[PDB]
Amino acid sequence: FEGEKVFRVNVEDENDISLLHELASTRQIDFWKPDSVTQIKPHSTVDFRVKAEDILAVEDFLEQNELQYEVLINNLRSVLEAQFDSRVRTTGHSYEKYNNWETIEAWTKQVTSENPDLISRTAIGTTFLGNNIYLLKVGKPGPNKPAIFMDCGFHAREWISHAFCQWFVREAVLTYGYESHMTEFLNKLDFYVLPVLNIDGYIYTWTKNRMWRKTRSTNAGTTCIGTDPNRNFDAGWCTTGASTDPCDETYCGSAAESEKETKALADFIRNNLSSIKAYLTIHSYSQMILYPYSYDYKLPENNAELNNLAKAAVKELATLYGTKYTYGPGATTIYPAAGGSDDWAYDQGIKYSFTFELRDKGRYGFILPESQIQATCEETMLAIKYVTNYVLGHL
Ligand SMILES: [Zn+2]
């Protein structure tokens, strides 16, 4: 990644959109925000990574076509080399470092072993490569308990999301019995926490390509690997904002739930639907709380409720470090995109369904340094606990 840059471009009108589409047809562009040229809406900004050999051609294109831009990251190599800046020295698990899959997997076994009265672990299925997909149930044992479901690591490169699910579990077990809200939460409900969904992809970001997003499944008739798991669910599947080309980063897959990982998640949720009252899915970056719908311009029946809940959660998050989040329906932040898990869960009857996009706002983008894990998780905890308390009181 030596000499690679990440650009941000201001798009005003449809002319700017088709210009970016033409640029992306001329050079290989890795869209960071949103996920593809096809998800770009008028009056927004767009972030994308450019290869070293393409920097001058891209800059020339932006300048001569009068697209206003800035360089977010001047040398991606420098940012990548600076990501591992944790002051915690150890080769084992740390909640303040990014942990590889072998380490996270060992952590799921250990944290469960150490806290059997608060945590149980199951494997809800296996990935394309045969890795167990672990799910942790966090709560004091009891009958007929409602549940909140939270997943992290849909997208391989969004490392802060995987880190957050681990932090959440730590907070649940260490504050139970000591902080009144968490104590009430674990007594009355369970959290189902899926710390990494896209395990094969996550491994790939550690071993071969830090910028990988998709699953690692094969596709018929092409060398292009993987499906976008957040375009693989049965929600207006593959009708908008995605791609039928396996070589695209938003490939919807060969069918809804074609991926072992997404099928395992959808099966678990269907099998547990009477219990699950909220669905929370954790991503990065851009500091947003989004709710349905993304697949269509239509609004959910309880739009006013979801908007108010999102507003309150965003305000609660800001109380800690002043971090600013935006919020709203998915289809107001990007061009409509089909096949999302938050939309799917909502259409199953789960009335509280939210996507969280964590820090930052583009300074480091996906490559958030370890030194920000703690503050990111701390403030995010406030929003999650706020949503939990709301859900508990609105059963
Ligand atoms: Zn994501």
What this model shows, in words?
- This protein is an alpha/beta fold and 395 residues long.
- It has two domains: 1-92, Metallocarboxypeptidase-like (Alpha-Beta Plaits, 2-Layer Sandwich); 93-395, Aminopeptidase (3-Layer(aba) Sandwich), CATH 3.40.630.
- It is built from eleven helices and twelve strands.
- It has helices at residues 14-26, 55-64, 76-82, 101-114, 159-175, 180-188, 199-207, 260-271, 303-321, 341-347, 373-393; strands at residues 5-11, 29-33, 44-50, 69-73, 119-126, 132-138, 147-152, 190-194, 276-283, 288-291, 326-329, 352-357.
- It has an eight-stranded mixed β-sheet with strand order 5-6-8-7-9-12-10-11, sandwiched between helices.
- Helix 6 crosses helix 11 (373-393) and helix 9 (303-321) runs antiparallel to helix 11 (373-393).
- The chain is globular, with a radius of gyration of 20 Å.
- It starts with a strand and ends with a helix.
- Zinc ion binds at residues 154-155, 158, 283.
- InterPro entries: CPB_M14_CPD, M14A-like_propep, M14A_act_pep, Peptidase_M14.
- It catalyses: Preferential release of a C-terminal lysine or arginine amino acid.
- Its main location: secreted.
- Disulfide bonds join 152-165, 224-247, 238-252.
Number of domains: 2
The end-to-end span amounts to 49 Å
Strand order of the largest sheet: 5-6-8-7-9-12-10-11
The CATH H-level homologous superfamily of the largest domain = Zn peptidases
Q: If helices are DSSP runs of H or I spanning 4 or more residues, what is the number of helices?
A: 11
What share of residues are in beta strands?
15-25%
Give the class-level CATH name of the largest domain: Alpha Beta
Rg over CA atoms, rounded to whole Å, is 20 Å
Order of helices and strands: EHEEHEHHEEEHHEHHEEHEHEH
The name of the CATH topology of the largest domain is Aminopeptidase
Task: List ligands, each type once.
Answer: zinc ion
Helix content: 25-40%
Taking the sheet with the most strands, its summary is: 8 strands, mixed
The assigned structural class equals alpha/beta
The appropriate CATH architecture of the largest domain is 3-Layer(aba) Sandwich
Global geometry: globular
Query: How many E-type strands?
Result: 12
PDB class: hydrolase
Keywords: Procarboxypeptidase B CPB zymogen Metalloprotease Polymorphic form, Hydrolase, Metal-binding, Secreted
Assembly: monomeric
Entry title: A polymorph of carboxypeptidase B zymogen structure
